[PDB]
Structure 1
Amino acid sequence: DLVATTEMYLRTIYELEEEGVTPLRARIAERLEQSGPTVSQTVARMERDGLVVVASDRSLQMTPTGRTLATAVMRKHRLAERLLTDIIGLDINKVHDEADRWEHVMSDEVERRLVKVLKDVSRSPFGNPIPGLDELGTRVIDAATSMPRKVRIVQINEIFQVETDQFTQLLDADIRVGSEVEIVDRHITLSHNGKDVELLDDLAHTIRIEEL
């Protein structure tokens, strides 16, 4: 019982972060269709197991081990969805639910085979990047990690820019003095309410952020 449950809590926190939603226990209860009390019980165990910390604001911060496990479950889940759609041909309306089960029993080595056999594993069939593939086998340029983080805009410093076409991109995605997600890819891209601005490097080095 217990292992699949933990993984589901983890993938759900992972999911909410990808969606920009604060990982709150009531948000997890609602999404998993579980009671709040029930969720509190599992989260308590997960804290005990070192997988999550409940911050003073009641959000759930996955620890590095928790996040590794979350990432793995998300990876299996999305690879299973790929397998089910691409090869098996299961009706798309059933694919998620099936992968909801298969994600807890797919081995790493099966994953590795899927990566060999599938045409593309960039994205699930539902449009989301498949993470953790590598593991399977302050200025923005300095501050971003290979792990999504929300930060606060403290300076944009347009005045120092030569290229200006991204000024309007920033205005259109609404930040100026706000709280944005930051990541390094193949680098740097910023997000704010499901609107992404992929920064060119000159901007990535002048934009400054803080926690928080």
Structure 2
Amino acid sequence: DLIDTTEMYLRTIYDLEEEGVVPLRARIAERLEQSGPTVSQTVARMERDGLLTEDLELTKAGRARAISVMRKHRLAERLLVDVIGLEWEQVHLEACRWEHVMSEAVERKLVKLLGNPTTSPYGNPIPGLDELGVGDSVEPVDTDLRRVDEVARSGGGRALVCRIAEHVQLDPDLMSELKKVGVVPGNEIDIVAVNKPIQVQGSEGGTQLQPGIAHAVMVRVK
């Protein structure tokens, strides 16, 4: 189902870090729909293998493995959108499985094919291109970018859509709404002022984002 439980535990910790959220067992359980028992046993198996280690934090090995999974995921997402032509809202679900079966060998081919891509189709930067040995490393979080929930709470304003985090992409219906209204990387949006739904307004229309969703969407305020 998860295809690789360890890699999905590694990448969910890395996802929470990109979302600026503290990695906690309770959140890993909520994200991967796992029981408290299952998480505690999986975390136990991973710290033994020297992947993770206050009160969760990745090791140098676990961080590299987490990044290599994310790299495969986002290279897979580009391949699926740009070449294969799978629907924008269905691509993440596919990449969630593909990320666990891709060699570094096929990645190097995909990097050349896609022309040294830096971001996923959802605007998220592709990490570990230095460890693959075909590009520069990236910061998990760009300090220039602001979160739609922060922009809203701070009084709103017009902003450029930059990143939609992996957590948002688990809902295809939501990804369909964002595509229609025009909340997509490179498009400008109007974030209305405001635990209360954030009103976002595109060129065509708008939609209401839950705090957790709004937090995951990162924008450049004009």
- Report the TM range for the smaller structure's normalisation: 0.5 to 0.7
Alignment correspondent of 1:4: 4
Matched residue pairs, number? 146
Q: Distance in 2 between matches of 1:117 and 1:195?
A: 29
Q: Quote the offset at 1:196 in angstroms.
A: 7.5
Q: Quote the offset at 1:25 in angstroms.
A: 0.9
Q: Distance in 1 between matches of 2:2 and 2:99?
A: 14
Displacement over 4 Å in runs of 4+: 145-149, 193-197
Q: Distance in 2 between matches of 1:148 and 1:80?
A: 19
State the AA in 1 paired with 2:131.
E
Deviations 1:48-105 (A, max 9, x none): 111101xx31xx1100000000000000000001100110001111100111111000
Q: Distance in 2 between matches of 1:128 and 1:104?
A: 19
Alignment correspondent of 2:40: 40
Alignment correspondent of 2:13: 13
**SS, match of residue 89 in structure 2:** helix
Q: Which runs of 5+ in 1 are unaligned?
A: 138-144, 150-171, 175-192, 198-212
Kindly indicate whether residue 60 of structure 2 is the aligned counterpart of residue 70 of structure 1: no
State the AA in 1 paired with 2:15.
E
**SS, match of residue 21 in structure 1:** coil
Kindly indicate whether residue 91 of structure 2 is the aligned counterpart of residue 95 of structure 1: yes
Kindly indicate whether residue 136 of structure 2 is the aligned counterpart of residue 136 of structure 1: no
Alignment correspondent of 1:50: 50
TM-score, scaled to structure 2: 0.60
Q: 1:112 to 1:147 in 2, by over 3 A?
A: same
Alignment correspondent of 1:25: 25
Q: Distance in 1 between matches of 2:31 and 2:2?
A: 18
State the AA in 2 paired with 1:33.
E
TM-score, scaled to structure 1: 0.62
Q: Distance in 1 between matches of 2:140 and 2:126?
A: 14
Q: Which runs of 5+ in 2 are unaligned?
A: 142-150, 155-214
